[PDB]
Design an enzyme around this catalytic site. Structure first.
Site, short mmCIF file in Angstrom:
data_model
loop_
_atom_site.label_atom_id
_atom_site.label_comp_id
_atom_site.label_asym_id
_atom_site.label_seq_id
_atom_site.Cartn_x
_atom_site.Cartn_y
_atom_site.Cartn_z
N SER A 62 -41.60 0.50 -4.39
CA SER A 62 -41.71 1.11 -3.06
C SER A 62 -41.68 0.13 -1.91
CB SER A 62 -42.98 1.93 -2.91
OG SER A 62 -42.96 3.01 -3.82
C1 LIG Z 1 -36.20 4.62 -12.93
C2 LIG Z 1 -37.36 5.20 -13.73
N1 LIG Z 1 -38.60 4.91 -13.02
C3 LIG Z 1 -39.21 3.64 -13.37
C4 LIG Z 1 -40.73 3.77 -13.31
N2 LIG Z 1 -41.11 4.46 -12.09
C5 LIG Z 1 -42.23 4.10 -11.46
O1 LIG Z 1 -42.80 3.06 -11.79
N3 LIG Z 1 -42.72 4.91 -10.53
C6 LIG Z 1 -43.80 4.49 -9.65
C7 LIG Z 1 -43.52 4.94 -8.23
O2 LIG Z 1 -43.00 6.00 -7.91
N4 LIG Z 1 -43.88 3.98 -7.43
C8 LIG Z 1 -44.34 3.85 -6.08
C9 LIG Z 1 -43.44 2.83 -5.45
O3 LIG Z 1 -43.97 1.74 -5.49
C10 LIG Z 1 -44.80 4.96 -5.14
N5 LIG Z 1 -45.65 4.16 -4.25
C11 LIG Z 1 -46.85 3.79 -5.05
C12 LIG Z 1 -47.80 2.96 -4.25
O4 LIG Z 1 -47.73 3.03 -3.00
O5 LIG Z 1 -48.60 2.24 -4.89
C13 LIG Z 1 -47.44 5.09 -5.63
C14 LIG Z 1 -48.33 5.81 -4.63
C15 LIG Z 1 -48.17 4.88 -6.94
S1 LIG Z 1 -45.97 6.01 -5.92
C16 LIG Z 1 -45.13 4.92 -10.12
C17 LIG Z 1 -45.63 6.19 -9.84
C18 LIG Z 1 -46.90 6.56 -10.28
C19 LIG Z 1 -47.67 5.66 -11.02
C20 LIG Z 1 -47.16 4.39 -11.31
C21 LIG Z 1 -45.90 4.02 -10.86
C22 LIG Z 1 -40.40 5.50 -11.58
O6 LIG Z 1 -40.79 6.27 -10.73
C23 LIG Z 1 -39.07 5.74 -12.08
O7 LIG Z 1 -38.43 6.67 -11.60
#
Ligand SMILES: CCN1CCN(C(=O)N[C@@H](C(=O)N[C@@H](C=O)[C@@H]2N[C@@H](C(=O)O)C(C)(C)S2)c2ccccc2)C(=O)C1=O
Length: 322
Positions: A62
């Site tokens: 993110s």
């Molecule tokens: C391509 C496949 N694949 C790879 C893996 N994967 C992924 O690891 N997802 C993470 C995600 O969506 N990450 C964040 C971006 O960093 C968003 N911001 C975070 C923040 O602010 O800490 C959050 C609030 C936790 S959600 C995620 C969500 C929830 C918990 C841990 C990690 C994907 O989603 C994804 O599609």
């Protein structure tokens, strides 16, 4: 002696990083601190010392989202006060959803709540080349040249045509791999309002002419928006520093294996600039494989980001702007 590292800031970074890695029972942690006007690396630390994480590669997740908003604004896909439909949806069976469900969010909301849905709809509204171009302008997929082994090993798409799911996941920071140094350089470019400079481990006399890669007005707009991440309701609230405005973005990534499978090991990030009213420093904090129960960037990396950035601002006698 022409070395740019400020040892007061190095020692602070090391101590806080050591503490955060221990507290979160993590494999390791890294922090890179950059002067946003010169590209000078003021602090660069791995904890433990021999875990060379600053030069290892990871999916930025993110942390790429501010560049997505900048691009959509540049292309006129959205305006400053736009509101996005952030209802979860499907792409060929792939489910695009947020940790927190909202039916609509402003652009500030999209960053504050880290909406994967919101940035993916922005990406699908633009050609695949749009974000490829922006990420490249900010230095992703270009080596850093500090003379450290590993610096050059990042993965960046050279693809000619993209599927809908690839375009969406790129918008929230998967399908590419970067070093912490590369990410610090992205954020230094944000702090300069769109002036790209290489990182330097040697001292320079300012000002340092850089490369204009993005309009000042657009970068400043998103910097203001990023301030919400460190206020109540924002994912990085634990990074907040008394007396100062900070502009940050949190992230959490599941680690990818070499066969492209995602495992239940996490990388937590907080990247940002301070003070938000006129940035002096860019900071990236990465925590690798936390094991103490928490794994979100806001829980794991944001607290140490605040402790480091706070120590930096005080040590450098920066005027409070809050
Ligand atoms: C391509 C496949 N694949 C790879 C893996 N994967 C992924 O690891 N997802 C993470 C995600 O969506 N990450 C964040 C971006 O960093 C968003 N911001 C975070 C923040 O602010 O800490 C959050 C609030 C936790 S959600 C995620 C969500 C929830 C918990 C841990 C990690 C994907 O989603 C994804 O599609």
């Amino acid at each position: 002696d022409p070395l740019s590292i400020d040892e007061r800031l190095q020692a602070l970074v090391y101590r806080e990083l050591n503490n955060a890695v221990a507290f979160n029972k993590a494999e390791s942690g890294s922090a890179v601190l950059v002067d946003v006007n010169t590209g000078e690396v003021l602090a660069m630390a791995n904890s433990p010392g021999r875990n060379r994480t600053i030069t290892d590669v990871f999916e930025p997740g993110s942390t790429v989202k501010p560049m997505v908003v900048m691009t959509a604004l540049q292309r006129g896909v959205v305006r400053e006060n736009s509101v996005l439909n952030t209802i979860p949806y499907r792409i060929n069976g792939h489910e695009i959803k947020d940790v927190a469900r909202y039916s609509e969010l402003t652009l500030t909301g999209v960053l504050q709540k880290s909406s994967n849905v919101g940035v993916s709809k922005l990406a699908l509204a633009m050609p695949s080349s749009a974000l490829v171009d922006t990420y490249s302008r900010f230095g992703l997929g270009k080596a850093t040249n500090l003379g450290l082994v590993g610096e050059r090993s990042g993965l960046y798409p050279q693809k000619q045509r993209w599927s809908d799911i690839e375009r969406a996941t790129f918008s929230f920071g998967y399908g590419l791999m970067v070093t912490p140094l590369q990410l610090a350089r992205v954020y230094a470019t944000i702090g300069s309002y769109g002036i790209y400079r290489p990182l330097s481990i040697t001292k320079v006399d300012p000002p340092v002419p850089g490369e204009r890669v993005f309009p000042e007005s657009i970068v400043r707009t998103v910097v203001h928006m990023m301030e919400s991440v460190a206020l109540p309701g924002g994912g990085g609230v634990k990074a907040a520093i008394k007396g100062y405005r900070i502009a940050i973005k949190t992230g959490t990534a599941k680690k990818v294996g070499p066969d492209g499978r995602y495992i239940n090991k996490y990388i937590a990030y907080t990247a940002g600039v301070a003070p938000a009213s006129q940035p002096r420093f860019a900071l990236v904090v990465v925590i690798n494989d936390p094991q103490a129960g928490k794994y979100y960037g806001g829980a794991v990396s944001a607290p140490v980001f605040g402790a480091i950035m706070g120590g930096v601002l005080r040590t450098m006698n920066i005027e409070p702007d809050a």
